[PDB]
Amino acid sequence: SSPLPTVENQFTPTTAWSTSVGSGIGNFYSNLHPALADNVVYAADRAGLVKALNADDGKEIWSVSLAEKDGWFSKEPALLSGGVTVSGGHVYIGSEKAQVYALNTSDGTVAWQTKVAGEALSRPVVSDGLVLIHTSNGQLQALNEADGAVKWTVNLDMPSLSLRGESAPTTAFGAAVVGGDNGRVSAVLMEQGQMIWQQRISQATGSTEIDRLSDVDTTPVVVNGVVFALAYNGNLTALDLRSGQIMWKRELGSVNDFIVDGNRIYLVDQNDRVMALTIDGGVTLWTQSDLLHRLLTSPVLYNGNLVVGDSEGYLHWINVEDGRFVAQQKVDSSGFQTEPVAADGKLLIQAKDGTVYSITRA
């Protein structure tokens, strides 16, 4: 592992509120994380529990359950995994049983429930009034906001090994841009799911070994006209948005997640070394590696700092110029692992077990 850095807090970091959610993800694989819209926080657990909460104080609004009734005293877990997405009147969640749920925001009644073509370990993405689902067996599927029917399906690649690492779609200017577990990046037109391009980003996994630390968020991000994407080997690549042509590849190390903002890329490698890069070239500016082998979440930007959680239950704030620590708190002794979320002035994060938390300072 690697010991915890010493604590020169520049602000005093507190926990605004916290409310638990079942018990919730544990040590199972899932990508469940909170969502916010309209001073409502929505959140879930593996079993099938879904709590809507007031964003200011954390008090519960509705708590529904999606678990199935199976056998005398057991309820059977819904196996929710595709972290919570919310848009329009609906709350969207996907499961490892190939189900996508659409729950009404007003009261969390089920509006529709569709069987999709494979597991939905990723965030549904809404755009166009179509709900986008990237399945574990290499499909891209598009569902109606309104009734949940499958407008279309695209077969992305000759199906491969299924890997840890979220793979949501992103959208830009009418296209879906999607990554995957097979070295491939694709752009699909959203009307009728027609192919625009497909770039091979690295070798199709050619029986090369899979390390236990590999966990690559393969979700592309489009800034200006550049597509940024990690291939499953943990290499960062930049592509021209129009044609999918490779601009460059960082065979740097092995990157689990990254984020973009302004003129910086901020990433976390599979060793838990944190790094900052230039946007045009992906040139490295600083590394912070005092967190080696604690087990970090994805990072977010909040109030101008990088925030990342670890399995030992700590938050860490990092200066965005180098690179040094700024604050650190113990928060929940079941660890962190799923991503912290930043929108509208709030910092939300969900722990394995101990579940939801708002965060600031005073």
Side-chain angles (χ1 to χ4, degrees), residues 1 3-362:
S1 191
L4 48 318
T6 31
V7 194
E8 260 315 75
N9 293 359
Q10 248 90 254
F11 51 107
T12 61
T14 45
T15 106
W17 48 267
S18 71
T19 126
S20 66
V21 178
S23 69
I25 259 86
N27 277 310
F28 299 96
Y29 176 69
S30 91
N31 299 130
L32 282 173
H33 65 285
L36 167 82
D38 296 299
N39 221 48
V40 194
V41 171
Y42 308 73
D45 76 20
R46 215 189 72 146
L49 225 170
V50 195
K51 271 176 159 267
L53 312 180
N54 181 106
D56 291 327
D57 58 3
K59 296 190 157 213
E60 81 104 355
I61 298 190
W62 43 259
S63 338
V64 187
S65 176
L66 261 45
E68 204 57 41
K69 222 85 189 144
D70 311 354
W72 288 98
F73 307 113
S74 56
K75 292 192 92 200
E76 191 58 6
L79 295 185
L80 310 176
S81 49
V84 183
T85 305
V86 41
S87 165
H90 300 135
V91 189
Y92 306 94
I93 306 162
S95 66
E96 299 172 94
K97 302 163 98 99
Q99 300 298 321
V100 173
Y101 302 89
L103 318 180
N104 283 295
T105 48
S106 65
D107 60 12
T109 52
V110 179
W112 49 264
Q113 159 164 13
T114 305
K115 182 170 210 171
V116 281
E119 326 185 43
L121 309 183
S122 297
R123 192 179 328 238
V125 172
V126 189
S127 134
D128 250 50
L130 285 178
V131 182
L132 293 176
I133 305 300
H134 184 215
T135 59
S136 270
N137 53 352
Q139 319 290 96
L140 185 68
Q141 287 193 312
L143 315 177
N144 274 204
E145 280 222 72
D147 60 356
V150 183
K151 201 186 204 280
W152 56 255
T153 300
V154 177
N155 187 357
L156 288 172
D157 57 23
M158 284 131 187
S160 281
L161 324 65
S162 158
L163 298 177
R164 294 209 274 137
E166 205 184 335
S167 186
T170 188
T171 44
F173 305 108
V177 182
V178 46
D181 294 336
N182 212 214
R184 185 171 271 180
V185 174
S186 313
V188 152
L189 200 32
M190 273 188 293
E191 298 161 53
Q192 200 57 243
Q194 324 88 281
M195 204 64 53
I196 324 172
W197 57 251
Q198 214 173 308
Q199 181 56 54
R200 163 141 275 107
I201 269 323
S202 70
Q203 269 216 336
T205 151
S207 298
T208 49
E209 306 272 52
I210 303 293
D211 198 277
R212 48 52 211 268
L213 268 10
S214 288
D215 178 34
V216 184
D217 174 8
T218 231
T219 299
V221 23
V222 180
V223 176
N224 296 139
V226 180
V227 173
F228 297 91
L230 297 167
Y232 71 87
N233 55 11
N235 290 346
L236 181 63
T237 334
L239 297 140
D240 170 19
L241 172 72
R242 193 167 35 62
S243 64
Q245 159 165 348
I246 291 166
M247 302 176 167
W248 44 263
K249 182 162 198 196
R250 261 298 202 107
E251 294 157 42
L252 88 82
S254 298
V255 173
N256 283 345
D257 322 76
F258 76 98
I259 237 91
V260 182
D261 198 72
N263 64 6
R264 305 276 112 110
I265 292 159
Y266 297 115
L267 62 81
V268 170
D269 82 10
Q270 68 179 220
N271 291 137
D272 297 302
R273 167 201 209 209
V274 189
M275 181 178 299
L277 317 174
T278 61
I279 207 170
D280 298 328
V283 172
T284 298
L285 279 155
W286 57 250
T287 66
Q288 166 63 71
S289 73
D290 286 355
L291 295 176
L292 234 68
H293 301 295
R294 309 187 51 89
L295 299 176
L296 309 184
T297 61
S298 285
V300 272
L301 258 21
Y302 182 57
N303 250 233
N305 302 312
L306 268 200
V307 181
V308 79
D310 69 26
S311 46
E312 296 91 330
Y314 287 85
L315 260 15
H316 306 95
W317 287 252
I318 300 176
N319 188 93
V320 129
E321 275 65 72
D322 200 329
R324 53 197 90 242
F325 299 118
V326 159
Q328 176 190 99
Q329 201 203 204
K330 164 101 117 146
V331 174
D332 186 299
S333 66
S334 93
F336 298 110
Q337 99 108 42
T338 244
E339 71 190 83
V341 173
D344 335 337
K346 314 176 164 291
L347 177 73
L348 307 158
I349 176 140
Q350 171 161 39
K352 320 262 204 85
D353 295 310
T355 305
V356 179
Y357 289 86
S358 205
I359 320 268
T360 25
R361 70 209 301 213

